[PDB]
Design a protein around this ligand. Structure first.
Ligand SMILES: [Ca+2]
Ligand SMILES: [Ca+2]
Ligand SMILES: [Ca+2]
Ligand SMILES: [Ca+2]
Ligand SMILES: [Ca+2]
Length: 311
């Protein structure tokens, strides 16, 4: 059991590290990446109590580069972190649609409920209004729909008649016809429960010569296509979705650090064991190994601790 004294000792050691000549990043990492998010909140509270300064602010001053990104993201609650990443994806004249998509397509009803609330508290506007302001067309419709966090909950009964009718409707709305009935697609894929849709997408293969992902690639393009492809992966197998995004983030020249960092920070306490298992099964070497090859120094050490172990 983690006590008040534990948080005070951690805060004391972190202050010690920060004020050490040259900054002791190793201690800061060893501690923070090996505490739960709730413990890090306790630690920040104790830190402020002892120094009269905010821990996030002190660490922003003490750290730099990608390490600073990792540690500052770890210091936020899950909902704060997601809300701030959403805010960042909409900042400026452009939109980081990949990041917007990743978060909105993968978060559950309960996660999105908290994100909607916390985003309103942090930025004083509803998440939905910022999404509307940054997006347009069917991509906007889909994002707004998902961000409500009102998907049907997993039922007690498998609705086989509806599984079949939804599969038919997805087919009739897309591959069977000229053009696409995109509102039908949005309705089915946002409203039905996840286990229901897993079965719908399998039944869909009975009607369509192409599976759901290939059908999306044939029917739609741009941000809308990107969004549906991410959504369907999240529904089918979310740990594998994140394993693939991690792989993509490191596979080539350099690193998409913003994605690597966000996934390691946000999934470390959620489903990191399943992500690792899917990753190792598909890629043959561990997530740990890929992080090792792509990153270096204290930053690498922090990501490896968030990974939690080799496979
Ligand atoms: Ca140093
Ligand atoms: Ca800094
Ligand atoms: Ca923008
Ligand atoms: Ca079509
Ligand atoms: Ca690389």
């Amino acid at each position: 059991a983690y006590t008040n004294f534990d948080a005070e000792r951690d805060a004391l050691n972190i202050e010690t590290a920060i004020k050490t000549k040259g900054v002791d990043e190793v201690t800061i990492v060893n501690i923070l990446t090996n505490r739960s998010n709730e413990q890090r909140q306790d630690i920040a509270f104790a830190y402020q109590r002892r120094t009269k300064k905010e821990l996030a602010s002190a660490l922003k001053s003490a750290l730099s580069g990608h390490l600073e990104t990792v540690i500052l993201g770890l210091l936020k609650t899950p909902a704060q972190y997601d809300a701030s990443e959403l805010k960042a994806s909409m900042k400026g004249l452009g939109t980081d649609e990949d990041s917007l998509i990743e978060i909105i397509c993968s978060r559950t009803n309960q996660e999105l409920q908290e994100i909607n609330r916390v985003y309103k508290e942090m930025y004083k506007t509803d998440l939905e209004k910022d999404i509307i302001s940054d997006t347009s067309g069917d991509f906007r419709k889909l994002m707004v729909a998902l961000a409500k966090g009102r998907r049907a909950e997993d039922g007690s009964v498998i609705d086989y008649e509806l599984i079949d009718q939804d599969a038919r409707d997805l087919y009739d709305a897309g591959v069977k016809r000229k053009g696409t009935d995109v509102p039908k697609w949005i309705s089915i894929m946002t409203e039905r429960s996840v286990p229901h849709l897993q079965k719908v997408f399998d039944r869909y293969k009975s009607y369509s010569p192409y599976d759901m992902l290939e059908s999306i690639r044939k029917e739609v393009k741009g941000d809308l296509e990107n969004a549906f492809l991410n959504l369907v992966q999240c529904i089918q197998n979310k740990p594998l979705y994140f394993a693939d995004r991690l792989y993509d983030s490191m596979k080539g020249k350099g690193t998409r650090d913003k994605v690597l960092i966000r996934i390691m920070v946000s999934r470390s306490e959620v489903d990191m064991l399943k992500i690792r298992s899917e990753f190792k099964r598909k890629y043959g070497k561990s997530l740990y190994y890929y992080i090792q090859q792509d990153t270096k120094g204290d930053y690498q050490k922090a990501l490896l601790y968030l990974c939690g172990g080799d496979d």
